Design a protein around this ligand. Structure first.
Ligand SMILES: CCCCCCCCCCCCCCCCCC(=O)OC[C@H](COP(=O)([O-])OCC(O)COP(=O)([O-])OC[C@@H](COC(=O)CCCCCCCCCCCCCCCCC)OC(=O)CCCCCCCCCCCCCCCCC)OC(=O)CCCCCCCCCCCCCCCCC
Ligand SMILES: CCCCCCCCCCCCCCCCCC(=O)OC[C@H](COP(=O)([O-])OCC[N+](C)(C)C)OC(=O)CCCCCCCCCCCCCCCCC
Ligand SMILES: CCCCCCCCCCCCCCCCCC(=O)OC[C@H](COP(=O)(O)OCCN)OC(=O)CCCCCCCCCCCCCCCCC
Ligand SMILES: CCCCCCCCCCCCCCCCCC(=O)OC[C@H](COP(=O)(O)OCCN)OC(=O)CCCCCCCCCCCCCCCCC
Ligand SMILES: CCCCCCCCCCCCCCCCCC(=O)OC[C@H](COP(=O)(O)OCCN)OC(=O)CCCCCCCCCCCCCCCCC
Ligand SMILES: CCCCCCCCCCCCCCCCCC(=O)OC[C@H](COP(=O)(O)OCCN)OC(=O)CCCCCCCCCCCCCCCCC
Ligand SMILES: CCCCCCCCCCCCCCCCCC(=O)OC[C@H](COP(=O)(O)OCCN)OC(=O)CCCCCCCCCCCCCCCCC
Ligand SMILES: CCCCCCCCCCCCCCCCCC(=O)OC[C@H](COP(=O)(O)OCCN)OC(=O)CCCCCCCCCCCCCCCCC
Ligand SMILES: CCCCCCCCCCCCCCCCCC(=O)OC[C@H](COP(=O)(O)OCCN)OC(=O)CCCCCCCCCCCCCCCCC
Ligand SMILES: CCCCCCCCCCCCCCCCCC(=O)OC[C@H](COP(=O)(O)OCCN)OC(=O)CCCCCCCCCCCCCCCCC
Ligand SMILES: CCCCCCCCCCCCCCCCCC(=O)OC[C@H](COP(=O)(O)OCCN)OC(=O)CCCCCCCCCCCCCCCCC
Lengths: 347, 98, 63, 55, 120, 52, 459, 140, 57
């Protein structure tokens, strides 16, 4: 792509999301999703290969179906309330349709199948946009309609997402597929707490984005997309293996790292509402994710896998990728737990 | 509700089932997607016109414009798929299985 | 440190912790009422703003 | 009998074995648009008929 | 829960009523920790780019510390404002609803009966 | 809105079309103008939990 | 506690800013100085605990555990510096950093006032411990050992997190001093049964409880020597310390909820003691010995008597020094013959006379020869358990017979008989090795002179 | 599901076992059909009769598990005269587990299914007695 | 060189000792924030000695 056109397309992806986030009108929310989908397809197609074309097609079909269901919910809401204001919906059928539409857009289980495939089929930079920025608009909508959401439906989607994400990631060797299932699992935490305290949905979203952004950036720095290609990092950039280790432990939710904070604060809110079984089940099931994060740390940082002779040639050249914000992101991904009370700025 | 809504809502349901139950041609599924938009356009227009919601009269046009633009994007992807494989069959789009 | 300093330092610690504990129990009770009744500043889900309404004489009288 | 066998079998070995089996069920997919969207239709129908999520 | 506060000046980082609160002290231990995180980010930046970790680019390390401390100061001001608002709302509600928060007539242990459970 | 930029800047991007009892071209009223006006004024300011 | 936290933190820049050839000298010297200052924690009062601030406090329970913790760091640096001699400088410094960070988390863990602060630091110790096992362990099995260690601990500790937050919502505080005055009795309902299990299983797994102990023979055996020292000496005692604290808020339900865990411990100690008789790996035998000793601590904590609580505190301290000494003794043979098999090198008393004296002293403390503090702790527990039920003296008596058998079997197999003919690289014991052994046993026997300082708050 | 579950919990424990079994068989049978639907959709059967065979095999297993649990637990509550006891479900839950082993022709799955389904069933009964909420309504 | 090089060799040896002094000093500052009951407990409250102004610091 012409670099100027690439900038305009990224700004349009952001504009679509911003429109969703500032709109008080359901039509403008729908337009924001349409604009966002239109602008993201080129960045998925940009490397021109059959896998990128398949991923773009699978993504287009999923998102277009979701957006039609969203519009159906809006129109039903208009028929039963005569207004367009972005707020609680006034019909239970409209609520179910919009909740399902947003679950499809988020890739929540059982609407999840596209996330692993689409992420695998596109470049790492595109996957970073797909798994971080693309969650902002659907979450911002769920944040505003949650009082009218069916409690059983949203909690069912959350439980399934945590289960499927945890189990799906166990069988993966591709880094992009691991991040896709990790995203699905982390999605379930955000929606599980939404009925009780939407502020903790925002907290988990922000910290998830920071950690996911850190992981993709480090994968991009060495152009690694598989477990075995990442296992060579120790013999090229040792510092990167330590940073990868810290972030993976943080994503695993281990104290005293930053990733424990969202799990800690969500458990607190659910227990205040006499929800004991569900947070206990969620916390235990999250051990699945810790397992396949720990497997990566074993092959990357805590042991030394075999290298190749041609790796010696790489020693003579410096890293020249930008790695934008990486030093800041990795610190925020790991060392923020002592500042947990700062979550009140999200209130 | 009035009787007409039953049929417009059936049409949306029919085209949604048609969208979710693929055969082979990717083109046949895109038509079901456009069918969904047509039923939304009609139901929106009927609700807005009957209620005399004057400023909402422009909403069906915006719906049609944005949905046609999204249909152009869908057709472009179909052409790129047909270039890769020589058909628009969805069973050739299974590389990402692995 | 002598026993007196530790003793009265303990009382200062206990007072702060007892005060925080009572406030924690009060906040939960306040949240339960506000969410049940909707008469407080919290759980105040917005309704349509009535300044949006047009009060001009319309094209027809009955409205 | 106890330390090397049964105390392994009743907890870590069996729990680990089940997760592995569940993982292969989840990830043994054919990558077909047709089947994935067919499962969406089942999900929506179940959500209405069985769980009445539309109410 | 506090999204629709009656006195919520919407989409404002620090509404004007926050100016009645004491500012965070520049020696605040939380602000010192934020500065330390900035210093760690500066060291990591040297490490990933294979410069001498402690000495390389002292100008860059200084801007890491300053920017973290600068942003940290305002985030703490908002943090302290949001907890002040929470307490203000809580106490106003308790005053407006005395029937829901009655002062208990609370007895001494000489009067209240607690069962004894021997440990034997 | 998630971010209420419109209210902060005092610019009306899409509020003008949210309800049918807002100002219309040539003062054409919607059929249910009176009912919507009465419901909006009743529920104004008290929050949705009370309004329901 | 800042007078200990800050100096511990400064060990890190000291390690990183030191001359390349002085990393072991500098960190060892200053960690010993920190250990010396920890004796100021012995300002304990008869009635009130020593309450520093809103965050931290020290009573007669945590004080001895703190002194042991800070004492262990220099010993671990001494024990590690030989087998890390060919490691490159940066990785050596990172190894020391993990040890320092573990000490930092531990001393804050033992003084945390609030149970949720205790929890965060209690889990925090996992991370450096896992890294030490998996990165610097020697065998392929270290990777599997790390996973068993990690997921056994978290399977229990995540339910504990839910329970603790539930208690704070109901009581209003998790501050330990407040809970002493606001504690309410636990009614006997199904919901309280699972609260009790949530509050206890995490600590039970760390002891470990018999049945839930399979992680320990893996982790303690695959870790490097410093890893084994801290794992057995201190980290097992987080479970005991946690149980001793949390049982405050679980009465009277502990009366009947204790029964299944008392049976597991009383029978488990006999099972694990028997296992020691047929172990072929010297390190594995020492690891199973720890499970048997900690079964007594579990039983002592669950019967909740003043004598059992004094005995439990003494045993935890006594076992910490003894088990660490045994691992160091076993490691010194491993650094010569590079095998953990116990029957491989025999008759070492003929080749290493003084080292055979350390083996004897380590063995005698392990089988609880009076008047060692090992015996004092075991005796007090046996006394209290006899009052709980006279019949327990049979299980306690059998265990003491079996313990003597495997303790001296280890001594006889390795130190006595005829030396192995083909093993010809048993060089004389280094000054470092001899100092390392005597820094275990000398404090252990000195405590016999003044036992009260390790008898805990019930004294 | 809301209705069948309501019918099951309306019947007092250890009484009207025939109606108790009808409810649990329906709950199990419905779960089997749901499993069949996703299985047939995601793993296409080789032929139409193969797919009907899979559905029958999965549905019958789930209904058989549901019937035995409902029947066994209701009878245990009757011969012991202990309606409000989790042990009845613990027994019913294991019986359903053994059926799962028998249908899968595996002793190992049967024993694992006994232990885990038995405990799960007991927890369900405890929750009903104590009012444990799985999907708890927001309160604070 | 004397003084120099000696200092460059051995300056790290002030870190931990200065950590202890700083840690000690911060411990005292925390005690000055917990004076709500100084000379006010029922057990120890008393009249101040003539010159004396606080019973402990
Ligand atoms: C308006 C206000 C300013 C905002 C600017 C908006 C973005 C426009 C400028 C970026 C394009 C550009 O300048 O260079 C074009 C230029 C095109 O020329 P080219 O080299 O021929 O084309 C190469 C490919 O096109 C691309 O090269 P590549 O394929 O080799 O890899 C490129 C990669 C390389 O970039 C890196 O160096 C790795 C680091 C990138 C990730 C870090 C972003 C921050 C993470 C979140 C923390 C918040 C900060 O950068 C990307 O991945 C592009 C996406 C970056 C955004 C990732 C989304 C983060 C989520 C944001 C969540 C915020 C809410 C949190 C709560 O290529 C680039 O330089 C791309 C990198 C741009 C700089 C770093 C990324 C932008 C800075 C982060 C902005 C965060 C705001 C959210 C953005 C959301 C977008 C959907
Ligand atoms: C170019 C700007 C890009 C911004 C849009 C793209 C990012 C959107 C996603 C952000 C991360 C995820 C949500 C974070 C929520 C935090 C919002 C918050 O608490 O602060 C808002 C605060 C408080 O607003 P509030 O109290 O009315 O409510 C915020 C919205 N909720 C509660 C739903 C989260 O407002 C401000 O910060 C003042 C506005 C300053 C505008 C400056 C914009 C940057 C240009 C300089
Ligand atoms: C933590 C990791 C997250 C990443 C950190 C993000 C850093 C955000 C930077 C915020 C600091 C901004 C300082 C600017 C202060 C200033 O001088 O300008 C004021 C201006 C807004 O002025 P305003 O109050 O709206 O109008 C005055 C009329 N009353 O200022 C502004 O424009 C406001 C800037 C927008 C800030 C958005 C909200 C910031 C919160 C981000 C999420 C925090 C996550 C916390 C996680 C808790 C666990 C640690
Ligand atoms: C909590 C504390 C976490 C602080 C994190 C600090 C920032 C991240 C590490 C910075 C150090 C680093 O990344 O590189 C190691 C560096 C090696 O030194 P070198 O490559 O030779 O550079 C020349 C030095 N003038 O080392 C050096 O020589 C510079 C001295 C700093 C070393 C810091 C060691 C970091 C280890 C932290 C592990 C986690 C602690 C728990
Ligand atoms: C004027 C120019 C413009 C730039 C000015 C900006 C300066 C501030 C930016 C930060 C830089 C701090 C100073 C860094 C000094 C590094 C000097 C150096 O690298 O020399 C190495 C020195 C001696 O080492 P040597 O004896 O030669 O070799 C030992 C072999 N192992 O080793 C040392 O002695 C280095 C000692 C460590 C460095 C100091 C650590 C500072 C910690 C900062 C904490 C941040 C807290 C922020 C809180 C703010 C809250 C308000
Ligand atoms: C409350 C009291 C608590 C006290 C009791 C605790 C009981 C002990 C719990 C033990 C937990 C399971 C055992 C953990 C030990 C480590 C597991 C292991 O190492 O198994 C190895 C096995 C072989 O496969 P693999 O290692 O991947 O092959 C080589 C490639 N790395 O690896 C595998 O095949 C995959 C293993 C996946 C399992 C990872 C551990 C997750 C444990 C949580 C289970 C989540 C259950 C959620 C299910 C909900 C729905 C039913
Ligand atoms: C090998 C795996 C390792 C992991 C082990 C995990 C252990 C978990 C144990 C959980 C069991 C907790 C108990 C739950 C049952 C409900 C408890 C209850 O509320 O029952 C109350 C009742 C009390 O009886 P009572 O003393 O008469 O009442 C007071 C009047 N005097 O109840 C009573 O009668 C008190 C007696 C309850 C204990 C029964 C003991 C059963 C026999 C000993 C089994 C030992 C453990 C077996 C583990 C095998 C696992 C495979
Ligand atoms: C022996 C037992 C005795 C009978 C009792 C049990 C039957 C209970 C009634 C259940 C309803 C019948 C279930 C049969 C489903 C269809 C089976 C099937 O696989 O159809 C064949 C087809 C294979 O596709 P293909 O490879 O292209 O070959 C085409 C051959 N005509 O398959 C497909 O193309 C898959 C797509 C069509 C199926 C969509 C999913 C719905 C069917 C799920 C199973 C039934 C559960 C849902 C219905 C419950 C209500 C009855
Ligand atoms: C029963 C006591 C329970 C009491 C309440 C507690 C609920 C416990 C929930 C247990 C969940 C069990 C999940 C088991 C997963 C099945 C794993 C398996 O191996 O089954 C295989 C079997 C198919 O056979 P296979 O050979 O593996 O594959 C054939 C390929 N063509 O798979 C199949 O054939 C289909 C498997 C369907 C399993 C559904 C079982 C649910 C039964 C619910 C009955 C309860 C009734 C309601 C009670 C209400 C009051 C409590
Ligand atoms: C606590 C609950 C305590 C339960 C008590 C144990 C119940 C009996 C378990 C069955 C033991 C067994 O026999 O398993 C092995 C056997 C397969 O035999 P086989 O594979 O041929 O043996 C080869 C050995 N070299 O059996 C098998 O076929 C394997 C059966 C696998 C099913 C295991 C069920 C567990 C998975 C569902 C629950 C997951 C709960 C996770 C809890 C979270 C932990 C943190
Ligand atoms: C596929 C398997 C399908 C078979 C399972 C069928 C669902 C079994 C019923 C339990 C879950 C749904 C339910 O109906 O629960 C409500 C029921 C109580 O019924 P109710 O009449 O409302 O009495 C309340 C008095 N407190 O009972 C309850 O309150 C549920 C109590 C929670 C039990 C949690 C079990 C923990 C173990 C999960 C693994």
């Amino acid at each position: 792509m012409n670099p100027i056109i690439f900038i305009i397309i990224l700004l349009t992806i952001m504009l679509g999301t911003i429109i969703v986030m500032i709109s008080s009108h359901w039509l403008l929310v729908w337009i924001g999703f349409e604009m966002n989908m239109l602008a993201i397809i080129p960045i998925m197609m940009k490397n021109h290969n059959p896998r990128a074309t398949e991923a773009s097609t699978k993504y287009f079909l999923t998102q277009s179906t979701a957006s039609m269901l969203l519009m159906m919910a809006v129109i039903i809401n208009l028929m039963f309330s005569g207004q367009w204001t972005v707020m609680k919906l006034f019909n239970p059928m409209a609520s179910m349709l919009m909740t399902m539409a947003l679950a499809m857009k988020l890739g929540m289980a059982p609407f999840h199948f596209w996330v692993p495939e689409v992420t695998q089929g596109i470049p790492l930079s595109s996957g970073l946009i797909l798994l971080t920025w693309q969650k902002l608009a659907p979450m911002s909508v769920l944040y505003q309609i949650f009082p009218s959401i069916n409690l059983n439906l949203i909690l069912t989607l959350s439980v399934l997402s945590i289960l499927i994400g945890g189990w799906g990631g166990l069988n993966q060797t591709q880094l992009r597929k691991i991040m896709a299932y990790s995203s699905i699992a982390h999605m379930g935490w955000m929606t599980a707490v939404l009925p009780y305290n939407p502020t903790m949905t925002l907290l988990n979203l922000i910290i998830y984005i920071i950690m996911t952004s850190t992981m993709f950036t480090m994968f991009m720095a060495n152009s690694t997309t598989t477990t075995l290609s990442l296992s060579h990092t120790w013999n090229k950039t040792p510092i990167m293996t330590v940073l990868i280790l810290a972030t993976l432990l943080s994503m695993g939710g281990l104290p005293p790292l930053s990733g424990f904070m969202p799990k800690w604060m969500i458990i607190q809110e659910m227990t205040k509402n006499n929800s004991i079984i569900l947070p206990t089940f969620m916390a235990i099931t999250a051990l699945l994710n810790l397992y396949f994060y720990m497997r990566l740390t074993y092959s990357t940082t805590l042991t030394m896998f075999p290298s190749t002779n041609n790796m010696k040639m790489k020693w003579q050249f410096p890293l020249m990728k930008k790695m934008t914000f990486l030093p800041t992101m990795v610190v925020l991904s790991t060392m923020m737990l002592p500042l947990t009370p700062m979550l009140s700025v999200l209130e | 509700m009035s009787m007409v809504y039953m049929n417009i809502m059936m049409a949306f349901t029919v085209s949604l089932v048609g969208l979710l139950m693929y055969r082979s041609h990717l083109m046949s599924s895109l038509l079901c997607l456009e069918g969904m938009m047509l039923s939304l356009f009609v139901m929106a227009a009927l609700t807005i016109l009957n209620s005399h919601f004057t400023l909402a009269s422009m909403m069906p046009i915006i719906l049609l414009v944005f949905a046609a633009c999204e249909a152009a994007l869908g057709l472009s992807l179909l052409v790129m798929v047909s270039n890769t494989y020589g058909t628009d069959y969805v069973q050739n789009l299974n590389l990402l299985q692995c | 440190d002598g026993p007196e300093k530790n003793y009265e330092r303990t009382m200062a610690i206990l007072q702060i912790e007892a005060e925080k504990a009572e406030l924690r129990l009060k906040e939960l009770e306040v949240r339960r009422l506000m969410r049940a009744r909707g008469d407080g500043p919290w759980f105040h889900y917005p309704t349509i703003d009535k300044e949006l309404i047009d009060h001009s004489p319309k094209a027809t009288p009955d409205n | 009998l106890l330390d090397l066998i049964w105390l392994e079998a009743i907890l870590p070995k069996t729990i680990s074995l089940a997760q592995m089996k569940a993982s292969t069920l989840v990830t043994n997919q054919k990558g077909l648009i047709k089947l994935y969207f067919l499962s969406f239709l089942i999900t929506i129908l179940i959500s209405m008929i069985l769980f009445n999520f539309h109410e | 829960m506090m999204t629709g506060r009656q006195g919520r000046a919407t989409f404002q980082f620090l509404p004007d009523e926050a100016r009645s609160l004491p500012p965070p002290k520049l020696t605040d231990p939380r602000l010192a920790f934020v500065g330390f995180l900035g210093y760690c980010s500066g060291l990591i930046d040297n490490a990933i780019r294979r410069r001498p970790v402690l000495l390389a680019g002292l100008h860059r390390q200084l801007l890491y510390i300053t920017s973290f401390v600068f942003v940290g100061y305002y985030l703490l001001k908002r943090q302290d404002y949001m907890y002040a608002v929470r307490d203000h709302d809580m106490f106003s509600y308790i005053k407006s609803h005395p029937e829901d928060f009655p002062e208990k007539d609370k007895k001494t242990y000489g009067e209240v009966f607690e069962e004894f459970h021997p440990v034997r | 809105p998630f971010f209420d930029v419109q209210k902060r800047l005092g610019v009306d991007l899409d509020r003008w079309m949210t309800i049918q009892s807002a100002e219309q071209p040539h003062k054409i009223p919607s059929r249910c103008h009176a009912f919507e006006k009465e419901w909006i004024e009743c529920a104004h300011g008290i929050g949705s939990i009370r309004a329901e | 506690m800042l007078k200990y936290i800050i100096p511990t933190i400064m060990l890190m820049p000291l390690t990183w800013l030191s001359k390349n050839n002085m990393i072991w000298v500098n960190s060892t010297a200053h960690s010993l100085l920190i250990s010396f200052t920890s004796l100021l924690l012995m300002n304990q009062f008869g009635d009130n605990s020593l309450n520093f601030s809103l965050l931290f406090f020290s009573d007669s329970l945590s004080t001895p555990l703190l002194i042991l913790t800070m004492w262990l760091l220099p010993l671990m640096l001494m024990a590690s510096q030989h087998h890390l001699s060919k490691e490159n400088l940066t990785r050596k410094k990172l190894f020391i950093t993990m040890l320092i960070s573990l000490q930092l988390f531990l001393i804050m863990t033992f003084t945390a006032m609030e149970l949720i602060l205790f929890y965060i630091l209690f889990e925090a110790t996992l991370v450096p411990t896992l890294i030490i096992i998996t990165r610097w362990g020697n065998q392929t099995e270290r990777l599997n050992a790390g996973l068993y260690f990690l997921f056994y601990t978290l399977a229990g500790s995540l339910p504990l997190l839910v329970a603790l937050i539930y208690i704070q919502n109901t009581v209003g505080s998790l501050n330990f001093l407040m809970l002493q005055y606001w504690v309410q009795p636990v009614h006997n309902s199904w919901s309280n049964v699972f609260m009790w299990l949530a509050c206890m299983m995490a600590f039970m797994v760390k002891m470990p409880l018999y049945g839930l102990h399979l992680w320990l023979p893996k982790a303690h055996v695959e870790a490097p020597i410093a890893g084994s020292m801290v794992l057995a000496a201190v980290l097992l005692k987080l479970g005991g310390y946690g149980m001793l604290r949390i049982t405050l808020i679980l009465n009277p339900m502990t009366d009947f909820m204790a029964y299944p865990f008392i049976m597991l411990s009383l029978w488990g100690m006999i099972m694990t003691s028997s296992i020691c008789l047929r172990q072929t790996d010297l390190k594995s035998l020492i690891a199973y010995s720890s499970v048997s000793h900690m079964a007594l601590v579990i039983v002592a904590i669950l019967i909740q008597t003043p004598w059992s609580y004094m005995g439990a505190t003494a045993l935890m301290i006594a076992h910490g020094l003894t088990s660490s000494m045994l691992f160091c003794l076993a490691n010194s043979n491993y650094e010569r013959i590079h095998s953990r098999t116990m029957i491989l090198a025999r008759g070492l008393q003929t080749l290493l006379p003084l080292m055979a004296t350390w083996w004897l002293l380590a063995s005698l403390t392990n089988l609880a020869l009076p008047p060692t503090i090992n015996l004092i702790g075991e005796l007090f527990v046996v006394m209290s358990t006899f009052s709980w039920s006279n019949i327990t003296i049979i299980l306690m008596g059998v265990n003491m017979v079996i313990t003597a058998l495997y303790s001296l079997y280890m001594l006889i197999m390795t130190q006595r008989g005829k030396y192995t003919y083909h093993i010809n690289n048993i060089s004389p014991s280094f000054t470092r090795e001899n100092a390392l052994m005597s820094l275990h046993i000398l404090p252990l026997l000195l405590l016999t002179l003044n036992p009260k300082i390790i008898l805990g708050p019930l004294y | 599901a809301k209705t069948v579950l309501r019918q099951y919990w309306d019947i007092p424990e250890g009484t009207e076992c025939h109606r108790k079994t009808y409810a649990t068989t329906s709950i199990g049978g419905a779960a089997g059909l749901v499993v069949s639907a996703y299985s047939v959709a995601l793993k296409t059967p080789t032929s139409f009769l193969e797919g009907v065979a899979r559905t029958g095999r999965y549905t019958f297993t789930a209904a058989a598990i549901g019937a035995i649990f409902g029947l066994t637990s209701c009878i245990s509550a009757q011969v012991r005269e202990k309606p409000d006891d989790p042990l009845n479900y613990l027994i019913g839950g294991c019986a359903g587990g053994l059926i799962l082993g028998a249908r899968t022709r595996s002793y190992g799955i049967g024993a694992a299914a006994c232990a885990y389904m038995g405990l799960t069933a007991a927890l369900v009964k405890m929750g009903q007695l104590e009012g444990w909420q799985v999907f708890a309504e927001p309160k604070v | 060189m004397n003084l120099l090089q000696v200092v460059r060799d051995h300056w790290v040896h002030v870190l931990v000792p200065m950590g202890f002094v700083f840690g000690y000093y911060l411990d005292r500052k925390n005690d000055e924030k917990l004076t709500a009951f100084r000379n006010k407990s029922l057990l120890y409250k008393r009249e101040l000695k003539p010159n004396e102004e606080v019973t402990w610091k």
